Design a protein around this motif. Structure first.
Motif, PDB file in Angstrom:
ATOM      1  N   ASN A  26      -6.163  -9.177  12.006  1.00  0.00           N
ATOM      2  CA  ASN A  26      -5.005  -9.177  12.892  1.00  0.00           C
ATOM      3  C   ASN A  26      -5.358  -8.924  14.351  1.00  0.00           C
ATOM      4  O   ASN A  26      -4.567  -9.269  15.235  1.00  0.00           O
ATOM      5  CB  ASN A  26      -4.015  -8.111  12.422  1.00  0.00           C
ATOM      6  CG  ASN A  26      -3.466  -8.394  11.040  1.00  0.00           C
ATOM      7  OD1 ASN A  26      -4.185  -8.861  10.157  1.00  0.00           O
ATOM      8  ND2 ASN A  26      -2.191  -8.089  10.837  1.00  0.00           N
ATOM      9  N   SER A  27      -6.524  -8.337  14.627  1.00  0.00           N
ATOM     10  CA  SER A  27      -6.846  -7.869  15.971  1.00  0.00           C
ATOM     11  C   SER A  27      -6.615  -8.918  17.053  1.00  0.00           C
ATOM     12  O   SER A  27      -6.478  -8.548  18.224  1.00  0.00           O
ATOM     13  CB  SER A  27      -8.303  -7.410  16.017  1.00  0.00           C
ATOM     14  OG  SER A  27      -9.173  -8.447  15.602  1.00  0.00           O
ATOM     15  N   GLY A  28      -6.563 -10.198  16.704  1.00  0.00           N
ATOM     16  CA  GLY A  28      -6.441 -11.253  17.684  1.00  0.00           C
ATOM     17  C   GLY A  28      -5.036 -11.710  17.995  1.00  0.00           C
ATOM     18  O   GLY A  28      -4.866 -12.811  18.527  1.00  0.00           O
ATOM     19  N   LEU A  29      -4.018 -10.915  17.687  1.00  0.00           N
ATOM     20  CA  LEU A  29      -2.635 -11.345  17.816  1.00  0.00           C
ATOM     21  C   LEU A  29      -1.871 -10.411  18.746  1.00  0.00           C
ATOM     22  O   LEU A  29      -2.390  -9.392  19.210  1.00  0.00           O
ATOM     23  CB  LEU A  29      -1.969 -11.399  16.438  1.00  0.00           C
ATOM     24  CG  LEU A  29      -1.779 -12.811  15.879  1.00  0.00           C
ATOM     25  CD1 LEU A  29      -0.660 -13.527  16.594  1.00  0.00           C
ATOM     26  CD2 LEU A  29      -3.070 -13.623  15.954  1.00  0.00           C
ATOM     27  N   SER A  30      -0.620 -10.778  19.022  1.00  0.00           N
ATOM     28  CA  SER A  30       0.240 -10.020  19.923  1.00  0.00           C
ATOM     29  C   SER A  30       1.665 -10.032  19.396  1.00  0.00           C
ATOM     30  O   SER A  30       2.255 -11.102  19.219  1.00  0.00           O
ATOM     31  CB  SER A  30       0.208 -10.599  21.340  1.00  0.00           C
ATOM     32  OG  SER A  30       1.357 -10.206  22.069  1.00  0.00           O
ATOM     33  N   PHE A  31       2.216  -8.841  19.155  1.00  0.00           N
ATOM     34  CA  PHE A  31       3.569  -8.752  18.619  1.00  0.00           C
ATOM     35  C   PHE A  31       4.591  -9.342  19.580  1.00  0.00           C
ATOM     36  O   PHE A  31       5.480 -10.093  19.163  1.00  0.00           O
ATOM     37  CB  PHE A  31       3.917  -7.299  18.310  1.00  0.00           C
ATOM     38  CG  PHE A  31       5.184  -7.142  17.531  1.00  0.00           C
ATOM     39  CD1 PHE A  31       5.171  -7.188  16.151  1.00  0.00           C
ATOM     40  CD2 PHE A  31       6.391  -6.961  18.178  1.00  0.00           C
ATOM     41  CE1 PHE A  31       6.337  -7.049  15.432  1.00  0.00           C
ATOM     42  CE2 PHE A  31       7.560  -6.822  17.464  1.00  0.00           C
ATOM     43  CZ  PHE A  31       7.533  -6.866  16.090  1.00  0.00           C
ATOM     44  N   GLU A  32       4.488  -9.012  20.867  1.00  0.00           N
ATOM     45  CA  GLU A  32       5.459  -9.514  21.833  1.00  0.00           C
ATOM     46  C   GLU A  32       5.528 -11.032  21.783  1.00  0.00           C
ATOM     47  O   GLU A  32       6.611 -11.615  21.654  1.00  0.00           O
ATOM     48  CB  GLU A  32       5.098  -9.037  23.240  1.00  0.00           C
ATOM     49  CG  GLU A  32       5.224  -7.538  23.438  1.00  0.00           C
ATOM     50  CD  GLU A  32       3.982  -6.790  23.009  1.00  0.00           C
ATOM     51  OE1 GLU A  32       3.554  -5.873  23.741  1.00  0.00           O
ATOM     52  OE2 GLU A  32       3.432  -7.120  21.940  1.00  0.00           O
ATOM     53  N   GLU A  33       4.373 -11.692  21.878  1.00  0.00           N
ATOM     54  CA  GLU A  33       4.328 -13.140  21.727  1.00  0.00           C
ATOM     55  C   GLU A  33       5.054 -13.574  20.464  1.00  0.00           C
ATOM     56  O   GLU A  33       6.077 -14.264  20.521  1.00  0.00           O
ATOM     57  CB  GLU A  33       2.871 -13.610  21.705  1.00  0.00           C
ATOM     58  CG  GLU A  33       2.629 -15.128  21.598  1.00  0.00           C
ATOM     59  CD  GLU A  33       3.451 -15.992  22.549  1.00  0.00           C
ATOM     60  OE1 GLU A  33       4.589 -15.631  22.905  1.00  0.00           O
ATOM     61  OE2 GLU A  33       2.941 -17.060  22.947  1.00  0.00           O
TER      62      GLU A  33
END
Lengths: 73, 114, 114, 114, 114, 114
Positions: A26-33
């Motif tokens: 998951n480290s490569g993701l963004s919740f806001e996006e």
């Protein structure tokens, strides 16, 4: 008309993430996006596809990977 | 250190400073999710340590107001639907509920006849 | 890094920050062309990294927010035409459409006969 | 210095600098409780030593102005209800004693039929 | 000359920069006393050298600009009743006068009878 | 360095970076004189060389913006007259005409009642 390919564009970005979340890096993701893309799709009412698209993507992972390993175990 | 009691939002470019509990009235809300210290989603941290939320910087006032004092605080010139379209995003329904009444309440006069 | 998911605007000296995809609700728009990283037409930047956009930022509220959530974001005392005029500059065809209805809709009461 | 007559408030994102005497106008005020040098309070930005108060900076102006010159000054945009509840937080019983009247005065004048 | 002609008013935490002769429109003014090098000013100084003043930083705008170009600059949103009590503190007697009329001027249209 | 096409003004504390050609749009403007490299200039903040100009920064916006694109761009919160006085000091004739029309339009409409 609201019709456009962009609907697919967000699809992918949402889809490549979901696959990644299932792939446990998951480290490569963004919740806001992610929340925003999911939000905008439903706002102009294409959720019934996104829900359907949701159904497929998870269904893809379990049968194609999870089911296999449990068989191998 | 690894955790702190103050969360700093960069909504729409303007900055806000607020407490974790301030972001926990509705734990289904977008804001609550950022408030969590989970490493499962890195989020959109900014160099200032703020969480880059990319919606309207201005109509976030009434939303965070309710998240501290539980009432509809709207600057007179701000647009009621402005918060509604903002409230829907963060997923706090209670404000979304009362907002609609404020619009409907508004029209009881603004839609009236003599 | 090699790229950031968001690009800051500096419209008329005021500042607006958002993600790249927010400027893409109608690719045939002024903001979209600059949103791309193509060097062949790359514009200039403020040292904050934001894009200079030499136009009225007062009426940018309705415009940029519709790019985010696709509704008419009005402020209490912002002129009906100004959003029409502003939107025309950005070329997000749907927005310029819905305003024309709003003004006509407005004249439905503002030009109404008892 | 062991003490400084100037207190540095970080009221929800917007800094306010004011004199101890101004906050101590009536000791019941929650603001007064902050000023004391007792060991209870420890919330401040480490580098700058400004008290972290997590409330709407915008509406704090009227609250602090009353605590500076004993009157209710509210910019036309700031909601009277917003300062009211804002005032309620700091417990300046006199200010809240005033705001409701202006609130009532505001509404009574508006809805008043001739 | 071991002295400068430009001062830094740290009003309300905000930094206002202005030149000595700008503040001396009314020598009976609070600022004019600040403008000097008297034996009763050295205490009120910042690490930068800016004089630490403890009044509103926003209503100060009309006061300082009047000392620049002898005319009132009220940002439209600000309240006329608010600068008056900032004017009173600074002791710009003439400025106190014209705002009061402005307050009276406003009622000509607002306290009118149709 | 031979010379800096960028020059760093100080306008009432707020640094306004800009380029000569922006400042050289009007032959008779105050800002034009600053551009001259003749020996008659002593307000450089030698820590960086920023020339000091003691006047209100807030209204410096429209002056500098017009000095790049020749249209009176405004942030609504700023005062209509304040920009008239502000430019008047800097001696941008063409602009002060425009604002004098802007005020004329503002009041003229404000001066009519059917």
């Amino acid at each position: 008309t609201m019709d456009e390919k962009y609907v697919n564009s967000i699809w992918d970005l949402l889809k490549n993430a979901i696959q990644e979340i299932q792939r446990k890096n998951n480290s490569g993701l963004s919740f806001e996006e992610l929340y925003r893309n999911a939000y905008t799709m439903v706002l102009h009412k294409h959720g019934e596809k996104l829900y359907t698209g949701l159904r497929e993507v998870v269904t893809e992972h379990l049968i194609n990977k999870v089911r296999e390993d449990v068989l191998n175990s | 250190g690894s955790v702190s009691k103050w969360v700093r939002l960069n909504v729409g470019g303007t900055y806000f400073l607020t407490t974790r509990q301030t972001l926990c009235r509705d734990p289904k809300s977008f804001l609550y999710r950022l408030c969590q210290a989970d490493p499962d989603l890195d989020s959109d941290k900014d160099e200032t340590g703020a969480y880059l939320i990319d919606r309207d910087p201005t109509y976030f006032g009434p939303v965070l107001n309710y998240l501290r004092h539980g009432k509809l605080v709207i600057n007179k010139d701000l647009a009621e639907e402005g918060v509604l379209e903002e409230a829907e995003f963060y997923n706090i329904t209670s404000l979304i509920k009362l907002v609609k009444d404020k619009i409907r309440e508004r029209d009881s006069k603004t839609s009236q006849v003599p």
